[PDB]
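dumping the sequnces here before i forget
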Amino acid sequence: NDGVSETLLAWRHIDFWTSEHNPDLNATLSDPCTQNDITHAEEDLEVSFPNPVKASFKIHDGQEDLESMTGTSGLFYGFQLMTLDQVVAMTQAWRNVAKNLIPDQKSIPPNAVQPVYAHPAWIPLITDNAGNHIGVDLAPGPNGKYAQIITFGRDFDTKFVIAENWGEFLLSFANDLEAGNWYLGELVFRDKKSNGPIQDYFEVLKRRTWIKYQLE
Amino acid sequence: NDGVSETLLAWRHIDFWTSEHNPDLNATLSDPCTQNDITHAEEDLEVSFPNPVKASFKIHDGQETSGLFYGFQLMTLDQVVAMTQAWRNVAKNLNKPDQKSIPPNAVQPVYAHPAWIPLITDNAGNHIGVDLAPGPNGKYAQIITFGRDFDTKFVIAENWGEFLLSFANDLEAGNWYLVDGELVFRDKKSNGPIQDYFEVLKRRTWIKYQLERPHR
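..and the predicted 3d for all of it:
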């Protein structure tokens, strides 16, 4: 019960959705990582990927738009799914930061995520290419869960748990797409049923995390 | 490089030492765990034991007890499972005195964490154990002190193997007194008095942190 099912189901919906509504974006989804790619990454980082994360990699090794010039277009409402290469390189980058070590580091829910700027076991899987990430937390706080999905990086003094595992994360993104929570071209988020304004996907995830903690 | 060698060598020294100098103590060292036992414990706790810890358990499933580690008892697998569950409930009660770490940021600054697996007890609420959720300047499966009188937590070894070996070296160095008797620690070379082994471990951690400080 790791979220492997959810990862596979999610990718089926996202593969279909992009092909129907945004072929240019579909085309950026890379071919599978092989087991060797993954094993080499696990040996470099001395880390064991959670099963739903490996499952996701064996469907797409991130996103890539070589012939573009305007920048790669992020799948998650502008934020880019990182290649395994980028994952390895960025994790190492963050480890350096962690060795080298302003404001108060906090967590929502409280005590779910370590109250620190950088941790070696925070594996970035998505980037805004501006220092911020979604990824997987392999060293939770005392009221967190192993391999929970968190926001972290340069503008996340407060870290948010946005999903129990990578599978649930992928699935909730796919549900946003199927509900029509988007506009376009480049993909952005809007709440369709409320006729809401365009919103940054991080702000959406943060509001949802805050709501869900409060009533629970 | 996990510390398995060290745990096997350590148990050889401790098995032979107790049979020579305290047979009553030797007699308390239980038979090996079986792999199923460990597998069931892992399933119960949803945790993967480090290799040197599993190796230790496949030599002695704890103690039947006057405590092996200068009065502190090696826990049976069942005691490990039950005590981890106990600390886990405490951690749930606390999501409804300043916690610190030496070295700083090596151990999460909290009273209780689900991923702190106790392996030794003073039978008074304190433990040595393995930390499967280190702070940012900690190491996975580092060995820590924690418990009711450990507002400050100490990293006392890199892995369970190195911990067992440093205990075996204390024995071989003659750093012991018997009060048949009960085993307590004294520094032989200094002709010092009897000391609580935890005060010794803490002191050693503090010394080693200070001497390594200069290097960057």
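Chain A touches chain B at residues 98-99, 101, 109-111, 114, 116, 118-121, 139-143, 146 (CB under 8 Å).
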